[PDB]
Amino acid sequence: TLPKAEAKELSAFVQSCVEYKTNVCFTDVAAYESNQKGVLSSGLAVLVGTHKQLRDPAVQRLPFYNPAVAEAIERVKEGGTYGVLVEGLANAAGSKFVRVVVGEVPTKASRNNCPARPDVVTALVTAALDEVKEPNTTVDVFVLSNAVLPIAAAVARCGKHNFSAKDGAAAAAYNSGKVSRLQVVFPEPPAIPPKDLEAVATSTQLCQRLVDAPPNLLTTATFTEIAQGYAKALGFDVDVICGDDLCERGYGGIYSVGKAAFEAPRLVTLLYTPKGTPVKKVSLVGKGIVYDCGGLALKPADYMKLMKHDMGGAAAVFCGFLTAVRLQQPVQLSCTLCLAENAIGPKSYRNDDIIVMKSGKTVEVINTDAEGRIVLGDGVFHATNELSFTPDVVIDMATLTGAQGIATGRHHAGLYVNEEGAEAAMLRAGRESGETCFPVLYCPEYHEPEFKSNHADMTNLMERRDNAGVSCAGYFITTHLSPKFTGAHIHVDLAYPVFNSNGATGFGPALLTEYFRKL
Amino acid sequence: TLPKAEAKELSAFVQSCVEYKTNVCFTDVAAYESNQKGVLSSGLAVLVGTHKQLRDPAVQRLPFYNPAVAEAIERVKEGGTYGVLVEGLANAAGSKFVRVVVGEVPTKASRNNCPARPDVVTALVTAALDEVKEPNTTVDVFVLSNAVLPIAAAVARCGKHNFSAKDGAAAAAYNSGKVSRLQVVFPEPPAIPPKDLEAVATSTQLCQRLVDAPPNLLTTATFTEIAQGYAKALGFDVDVICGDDLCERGYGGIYSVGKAAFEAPRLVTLLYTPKGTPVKKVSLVGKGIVYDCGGLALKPADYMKLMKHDMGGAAAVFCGFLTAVRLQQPVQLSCTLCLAENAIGPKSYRNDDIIVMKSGKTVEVINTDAEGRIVLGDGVFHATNELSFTPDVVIDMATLTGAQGIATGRHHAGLYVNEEGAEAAMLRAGRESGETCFPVLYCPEYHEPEFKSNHADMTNLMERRDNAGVSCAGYFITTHLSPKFTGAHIHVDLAYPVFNSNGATGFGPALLTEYFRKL
Amino acid sequence: TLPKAEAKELSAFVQSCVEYKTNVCFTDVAAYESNQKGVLSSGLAVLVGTHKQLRDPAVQRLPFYNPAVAEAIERVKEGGTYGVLVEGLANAAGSKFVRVVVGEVPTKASRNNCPARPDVVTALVTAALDEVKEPNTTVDVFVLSNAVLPIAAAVARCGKHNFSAKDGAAAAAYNSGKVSRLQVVFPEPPAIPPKDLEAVATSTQLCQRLVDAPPNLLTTATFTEIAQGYAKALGFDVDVICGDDLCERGYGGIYSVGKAAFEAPRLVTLLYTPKGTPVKKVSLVGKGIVYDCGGLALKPADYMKLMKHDMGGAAAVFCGFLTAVRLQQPVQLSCTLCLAENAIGPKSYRNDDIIVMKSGKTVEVINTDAEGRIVLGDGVFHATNELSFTPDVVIDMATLTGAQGIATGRHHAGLYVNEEGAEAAMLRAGRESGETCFPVLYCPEYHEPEFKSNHADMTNLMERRDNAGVSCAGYFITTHLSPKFTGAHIHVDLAYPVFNSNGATGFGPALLTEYFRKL
Amino acid sequence: KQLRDPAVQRLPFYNPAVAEAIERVKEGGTYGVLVEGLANAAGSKFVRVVVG
Ligand SMILES: CC(C)C[C@H](NC(=O)[C@@H](O)[C@H](N)Cc1ccccc1)C(=O)O
Ligand SMILES: CC(C)C[C@H](NC(=O)[C@@H](O)[C@H](N)Cc1ccccc1)C(=O)O
Ligand SMILES: CC(C)C[C@H](NC(=O)[C@@H](O)[C@H](N)Cc1ccccc1)C(=O)O
Ligand SMILES: [Mn+2]
Ligand SMILES: [Mn+2]
Ligand SMILES: [Mn+2]
Ligand SMILES: [Mn+2]
Ligand SMILES: [Mn+2]
Ligand SMILES: [Mn+2]
DSSP states (O other), X not given: OOOHHHHHHHHHHHHHHHTOOOSEEEEEHHHHHHHHTTOBSXXXXXXEXXXXXXXXXXXXXXXXXXXXXXXXXXXXXXXXXXXXXXXXXXXXXXOSEEEEEEEEEOOOOOTTSOTTOHHHHHHHXXXXXXXXXXXSOEEEXXXXXXXXXXXXXXXXXXXXXXXXXXXXXXXXXXXXSOOXXXXXXXXXXXXXXXXXXXXXXXXXXXXXXXXXXXXXXXXXXXXHHHHHHHHHHHTOEEEEEETHHHHHTTOHHHHHHHTTSSSOOEXXXXXXXXXXXXXXXXXXXXXXXXXXXXXTSOOOHHHHTTGGGGGXXXXXXXXXXXHHHHTTOSOEEEEEEEEEEEOOSTTOOOTXXXXXXXXXXXXXXXXXXXXXXXXXXXXXXXXXXXSSSOOSEEEEEEOOOHHHXXXXXXXXXXXXXXXXXXXXXXXXXXXXXXOOEEEOOOOHXXXXXXXXXXXXXXXXXXXXXXXXXXXXXXXXXXXXXXXXXXXXXXXXXXXXXXXXXXXXXXXXXXXXXXXXHTO | OOOHHHHHHHHHHHHHHHTOOOSEEEEEHHHHHHHHTTOBSSSEEEEEEETTGGGSHHHHTSTTOOHXXXXXXXXXXXXXXXXXXXXXXXXXXXXXXXXXXEEEEOOOOOTTSOTTOHHHHHHHHHHHHTTOOSSSOEEEEEEOOOOHHHHHHHHHTSSSOSBOOSTTGGGGTTBOSSOOEEEEEESSOXXXXXXXXXXHHHHHHHHHHHHHSOTTTSOHHHHHHHHHHHHHHHTOEEEEEETHHHHHTTOHHHHHHHTTSSSXXXXXXXXXXXXXXXXXXXXXXXXXXXXXXXXXXXOOHHHHTTGGGGGHHHHHHHHHHHHHHHTTOSOEEEEEEEEEEEOOSTTOOOTTOEEEOTTSOEEXXXXXXXXXXXXXXXXHHHHHHSSSSOOSEEEEEEOOOHHHHHHHOSSOEEEEESOHHHHHHHHHHHHHHSOOEEEOOOOHHHHGGGGOOSSSSEESSOSOTTXXXXXXXXXXXXXXXXXXXXXEEEEEEOTTTTEETTEEOOOSHHHHHHHHHTO | OOOHHHHHHXXXXXXXXHTOOOXXXXXXXXXXXXXXXXXXXXXEEEEEXXXXXXXXXXXXXXXXXXXXXXXXXXXXXXXOEEEEEEETOOBTXXXXXXXXXXXXXXXXXXXXXXXXOHHHHHHHHHHHHTTOOSSSOEEEXXXXXXXXXXXXXXXXXXXXXXXXXXXXXXXXXXXXXXXXXXEEEESSOOSSOHHXXXXXXXXXXXXXXXXXXXXXXXXXXXXXXXXXXXXXXXTOEEEEEETHHHHHTTOHHHHHHHTXXXXXXXXXXXXXXXXXXXXXXXXXXEEEEEEEOOTTSOOOHHHHTTGGGGGHHHHHHHHHHHHHHHTTOSOEEEXXXXXXXXXXXXXOOOTTOEEEOTTSOEEEOSOTTOOXXXXXXXXXXXXHXXXXXXXXXXXXXXXXXXXXXXXXXXXXXXXXXXOHHHHHHHHHHHHHHSOOEEEOOOOHHHHGGGGOOSSSSEEXXXXXXXXXXXXXXXXXXXXXXXXXXXXXXXXXXXXXXXXETTEXXXXXXXXXXXXXXXX | OGGGSHHHHXXXXXXXXXXXXXXXXOTTOOEEEEEETXXXXXXXXXXXXXXX
């Protein structure tokens, strides 16, 4: 039992997440001219585009353009911003001056990147929004790219985060009071409708909120409640297997990992079936480790910090699922959240313990800090064996390995995929969405020997850690796929892309949305 | 909750502390000649003074003096002892020989030290008492200094400790059977009355007892009981905020730090108002971490050893408060004990958790092993906001940082102080009392940026640990002072001065007594 | 200067490498029947193939086949061996019994692997050769695969190594006396002529020898002498820039890395131009760190062990070059060996030193143990700027990062490549040759910021080591490409594939040979 | 306070944009504004004025 004040805070936080609405809206230049008649929304305007786009004659026709802005365009550095005052520009806030911040997007983009470079878009707008003078204002963000989806997600993830505990925000269910309403103004009417773009942005930001949230607010229980709240509101199915019932029902992996914690582990499965025939049946599985202390294999404090992000895969699949429901995408979806806190205490699963996985395979625990793969093993078996359908594609997303950062870096999620076709499709989705990925070695014949055990079917940790660590963690997960499943399996290791130095990025949902789109 | 045998042991230990009486008494040479008529109290006598004092003609008139003693004076090394037998010296134990141990105190003393060098006095008497032949005897300690307060504390802290578990003492409520009664014989009638000196010595030793006591005996609960016992006996007020009530009442800092532990955290506030108009209103706040395991940021065993001393600041303020009550010093006092065990388990506050402090400010926990500043933050806000008066001066005392030892060393507590005047006054009190201090950098404009947080008002740990660490910990505490408070704030970091290789020193109470004296 | 006995030993070792001849020959079943008329070469015969190949009717017609061998085929485990005695089988050693060892090769092979699974072929033959009874024998190795190139290299790298210091071999210029002559018997006449296969095998084993050799034998000087010896013998060009001349000629990278060592660094460039028009101009550049102690950034002993392998990239390109010359492949080649010992002493380049690279770019040395990329920077600039031709393709090979093992593992060299076409071609070559590769992230826009320096053009080490470390090391190298070069650059990180628990693998040369074949 | 001294108005680069920079600049921060047609030795169309 929790103190009443803490329970009240948790309920309010749940509600803040269930009712989360985005601060971003979308329009185009002609519609803007028509609706606002040259009156800026506030005393700040942002203009972002490539060196060339910024010099297009059409830019001169923008309502804030003048010779100072032209000079800003000359003086701005690639990847940088440059601000100029414009006197007596009509604006809804009534200010003698409007500040116009120009940002230059690079055109350089490697074959593994998104050509629109939404990464820099995000950074530019973030920087520009630091010039906001007052709160509760609307900032016009004029973008010269028509790459609407990656730009939508880029702007959604930019600026001050909706999650905040600063300056009394704790009393307002941790809804930030520092966020500006953002009006993205594309050159042309967007190929994807504005309300659809809002739904994408909303999911990016909800994902960000969940990840940013500390574990004292986002627990196994509150995450479950949030999912249940969305289920009631949007009318999808929710199945919860909780605490000791996991043990009784043979879910030894997730049970063992989570059982030491104050809040019980949960296997939460969400179902969405579209009207009419689905283009595909897809099962999503997310690593929902609300906090990873390491268990008995305790992390040092510097590594343990930011392990509140260890549910980033669960948040990603959860929010991608929400977007699919909200936009009524024609994909049949399961979304299985593998919720646990990897805690330390008398009930800790041990370095030596042998787990009976839901798959029936036994796992010797070499290291309790390799918890994610165990939890996901139960998740994928559940998805591929225990649902009312058998999926064509299984996608698991997880903040799984430090190796991932070493291998594919801070901006590219690592892909371990059993089929070239699915892999290429996810890579395409990454390049289109901006939520970029890169493959890691798929070679089960070389991963399999690393998990030999004297007494169990397998260990949970490689004998040699310098033998394709991102890949091996993926391999472990595959051993727990049901034999009934013969489809494509996409393992997404997103340990690093889910955050940056400002906090969560909301990486993952837009990737999924784009992937679903092209199925 | 506890086994019956353990509960009985705890009660007995509480009683041993509540009823603690000192082994030291004080007199002077003429009163001694008058009451004992040249008959030594036992077969051991100690003579301590400087090279010059030892050669004063008055020394020849001491009842034990003879040519052997004169020779001891020639042979003794500075900072050392030298013992000689004297045959047929009248003594109350009827010993054929009396052992006379001479000890030479240095005169060398830097401007940051106590000129009477009580540090050496303590060491000399400690060494001399090792020559005690039988226990339960009274040893005459003839001191040639008239620096009565520092000598009183020095002798109080010397020799075998009143806390012991050796040789069956556990059955006697851990009251040592190895302690000698000590009769300090000053040259002149002491400027401070003997019974007043006893009260000081008593507080030094009670402080020593509490600090020495292992955490299986001195818990959050037993410390609270001890305070309550003294409150009934001496007639002062006691307020206790316990366990989950700390959470309900907004004391998020001390609640979060303490909640993992077996015994609940407590905020214990004691009040003393003198009969007259007080010279000053002073609020004392003490770090009462009964044991600091580090929490989830677990300490290695070699660092974790001696973290039973982590309540040294609470003991210091508690015992300083007792002395003020017993001697009826004309200071109005609050004494707030911030009691918690920093424990590891499922309920552990986390590296990532965000705390809502009593001050209303939010704290992002970077490292759970920086618990003291958090607990103190709630303590100082309580003192400056929640009491029936507003203090002129806030003094917090805490075994706060390893940096303290690096900066100011084993014998000098570090002072972080917002006013030059209060700082100088505490320094002077340290020099007079022998419980020496030294300032650390006060520069809030440079400390403040170290605690920047993405999501909370502040972190609990510096981004850079090599940027005035003693000072930064102090700074943190100041951020939680009430806006209602506009007085002097003295932060005392006494991590190292509270112990030496023999255990607790009882450092702190005498410092406070002397400070109160000169207000 | 060296002791005379050490100089004699080095000369002999040089000669052993320059004159190295392989122990492997190649034939086919019909030619074997014709030349040996059913008489086995010795008392051991090896039969290796897939489960299915082993059950082909043709197997029954092999000269050693009998019912015991049929049983061995039933009893052998996948990836294992099984031996049976056959009495009175004609053999050249006149052995009462012939031991026939059957080995089963798996057919399982992922899309990133060589379908013939030469990895297992090597392991099987290695195991089987442990049954050799006497030395200086010829062992018939009957292979059921017709994948002649990968099998040739697989057998070349198997069994006991030609480098040895056991049992007096030091007195025989470290030529092992434990090696068996091996006669590989393919089912059909090999698509590649036997003498051409011998040249491939010879290069695999020479590469192995150089890598296995400890740095007291294989020094910057002896490696250079070996290259000169081959140049005299085969009639290709050799250019040597030695020691202080590197500094005088602006080769600040390789000079600074190597200058602390007892033996001077050398930039050794070899040239081969075929008769007639080359299909391509290719420049090879190899990391020839004869020993990597870490420099002032000293490695711990457990990591420093096996840094004699740190010239594995130089050995690879060197031997790939030799094969091209010996087989007269129609490729114009340069081969640049970046030879240095990364030593520790008074002349050590420092953590802080600023290097003026041959490229004209300055490099701030953050860490002296990131030496390889520096040495290679000078190598690739040399190749792309200082030769009599400009290459179409630059291939650098290096044992460059620990990240490589983490990312792509022990069997797959990491590829960082500026063009998709070249990457795909090298990957194809890896799958055909058996010397498998896998790509790492190519994304210069994300690597570049990691190398920002306050005072130099760049650092030699990433600010963040968890941001695509294999890729970032590659990126560094690319910054030193001449602007004159506009072709394909293939960076091969082969830190782990160059060795296994038995020592060097001779990985690299066959990869190159196969790549050159398909140009 | 120094930035709001009347003497500041008499500086050769001062104009209403600069005055606005003084309002908008954050403590410990900078804020830059363009001033068109201010005489300068480099003959620059605009002079950038950075207030701190
Ligand atoms: C110690 C090892 C057995 C396993 C360890 N991984 C973990 O503990 C995972 O549960 C982590 N949740 C993976 C991770 C690492 C760094 C940043 C973000 C995420 C790892 O090193 O990757
Ligand atoms: C790990 C850091 C965040 C903070 C740490 N301090 C602590 O844990 C405090 O709670 C300790 N109670 C301070 C301490 C250290 C050494 C000897 C006596 C007392 C310190 O290093 O000073
Ligand atoms: C210390 C770091 C700056 C760089 C370091 N790399 C090196 O020292 C390279 O010179 C090593 N030669 C790379 C290496 C590491 C492990 C096994 C084989 C080869 C690495 O750890 O990757
Ligand atoms: Mn984890
Ligand atoms: Mn973990
Ligand atoms: Mn502490
Ligand atoms: Mn601590
Ligand atoms: Mn190296
Ligand atoms: Mn190195």
